[PDB]
Symmetry: D2
Subunit: 220 residues, 4 copies
């Protein structure tokens, strides 16, 4: 396999949120077969960001997912040619983000070219007031649609004053070559900011992701 | 400790509904094991048979008291008895068919009683609901979170279709206790709902659910 | 025509909002070809209602629409047999209402049998806190889909103390016989509560609705 | 006033739809007090576009709106400083587009700096199969929220075959200086492609927009 037990990551995100332009560079490494990874992210244009950094973090690669052998791994199969994915993120106060990420590979390093856009966030809402603490861990539902793989996940930001702020993710993952498509399944995630400075100019970010079927037995 | 929710509980319910303008009534009787998160219902269409739409759109409306809760997650549902609770749900399908439901859940003795209203609007006539092209719901993971002193649960649901592929529905439920109960932290309920048996028109259906609550299985690094 | 210049209206709404059951009866009259009507509405079960009465009022009949001769009138064509319609009302704080109304006629009177449900309204939102003043006038977009007529409208409640609370309506209107189907067109509305008592047990309700094409010409190529 | 009876237009849009990157330049002119304008658009990168051009056209300036004297004109008031706007475009098959446009002025010319993104369009749907004929004329609902102006409009594309494909627009318009805010009102639109070459590399585009209150009298 061209996907090595350890893979490096280099990325560039260009984005606009609430009319504010920014650029973030990232580099890191992970263990694709263990489903873990760490990124160091640096804001290079647009500092200090005026919005909650958490809206960006799930856009900073399902190749980093532990797949059991009885679930087809759409993502690792797509390399070396790679894949791109598209996502809409619809927040409960009708802020909407979109993102597109093109994922390529050279040697033992993935490269991501990322676009991120955010519109219609209310000025006193938790994104523009930076009142989020973290995403909760989540379970993404993965299902084939029209020859590509979709993943939908109900996401929730824990808020500074207590309670949660909900966002619905709809992602489409698109291999650049023909691969075997998987059966319906789940990817459980936990994404965490491990360290940040005061304005989130420098952020260290970790994700754990593991695929599974339901382990509830079927009675029919 | 001793609970009014016994290891086995019976169920009696009545659903009154309208889908695509078609009125119907369904009666159900069954039993389950609330602490094991399992249950079986026998359902009979008593008015409006045969139904002209996919029976699967109804099945998650036929009680989170039937959920296996680990000791370290507050069980919102079992705490609320005997007084009970009601819940409200919207079910938004990807072709903009929309269903709503309200269910009032009470208890007498060893039996739960549900009084259910179900409505569905704007299902496309050639879509999988009105063409009865669904096979089952997939198993699911519902996200539970407190808001305004009550419990919300949201779940991304998918119907497997005849011929392949899935038809998606977004569920938003609010669960509302009739008495004060200890509120849980954010958590998950994994479900698998299954029709075990049905006659040709689904006038008689046997329905099973397994539901288990959990936190994430993944450790935290931070 | 079986639709006379003045028609009477009788209706019954049975509903549940936020778990609260209620029943409302209505009686009134209007002028179908002028697009105007008045209803007198009385809560007979569930009083006093604990939610904003405005969420109900557009559910209390597009036969009352002034249709120009060059737009097919889906609604008047379907009588005497009548029609039913189905609606979802998605509010911006994710309260959702559904309604189904079956509309029949006997003699000079329309009859509506209505079901109304509302779920997941936030307890401190403007519906459960009765902070609405009125619906703004609106423009509904009408289009045929799969042999029946859809109408979608962006609606807005003006709030006490200012600003608006938005709701997206999606309605399907279903004739009980074959009728000539219209081209894409618009229905402009203004619905108004003319009078109510303290708890809205007794409400007097008016609607004006007029169909049209766009007022803007198409540019020659 | 700095808004002359005829104003020129220059714009650049950079975008990504379905993972396809493109750039479009435009130039034109219009009559802001008549609510009319014409643009000639030229695809400079990413030609030919693989998706229906109609998804772009409403992103190619409410300063071109006929405002009666009794409705405050949010858009003309904000010049010369200008404004930016943000929009989400949610299609009924859950394709979603976002756009952000920054509108500035120099002399008798408007300048637009536009970003457009489109995600999750079905591969055999009418956008990616280029089955759209036009937008229908529309009525946008304009209402103040949190000190800025929102406009929401139910849009419909007429399709090859004669049915319609629906999209819901939510726009926030954001002045760069304090302006008199309008009461709730309507903007009626008709946008039309007047001429195009085979692949829509070159498009001539017209919009007519007119603000009004409801014509219907109030009985209360």
């Amino acid at each position: 396999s061209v996907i090595k037990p350890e893979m490096k990551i280099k990325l560039c995100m260009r984005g606009t949120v609430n009319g504010h332009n920014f650029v973030i560079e990232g580099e890191g490494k992970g263990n694709p077969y263990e489903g873990t990874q760490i990124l160091d992210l640096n804001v290079t244009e647009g500092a200090p960001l005026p919005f909650a950094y958490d809206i960006l973090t799930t856009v900073f690669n399902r190749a980093f997912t532990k797949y059991p052998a009885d679930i087809q791994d759409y993502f690792k199969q797509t390399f070396p040619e790679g894949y791109h994915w598209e996502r809409s993120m619809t927040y409960e106060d009708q802020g909407i983000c979109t993102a597109t990420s093109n994922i390529s590979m050279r040697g033992d390093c993935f490269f991501y070219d990322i676009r991120f856009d955010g519109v219609n966030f209310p000025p006193n809402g938790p994104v523009m007031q930076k009142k989020t603490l973290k995403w909760e861990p989540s379970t993404e539902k993965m299902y084939v649609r029209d020859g590509v793989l979709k993943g939908d996940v109900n996401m929730a930001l824990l808020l500074e004053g207590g309670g949660h702020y909900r966002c619905d993710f709809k992602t489409t993952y698109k291999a650049k070559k023909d691969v075997r498509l998987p059966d319906y399944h789940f990817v459980d995630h936990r994404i965490e900011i491990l360290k940040h400075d005061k304005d989130y100019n420098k952020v260290k970010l970790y994700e754990n992701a593991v695929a599974r079927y339901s382990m509830l037995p079927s009675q029919a």
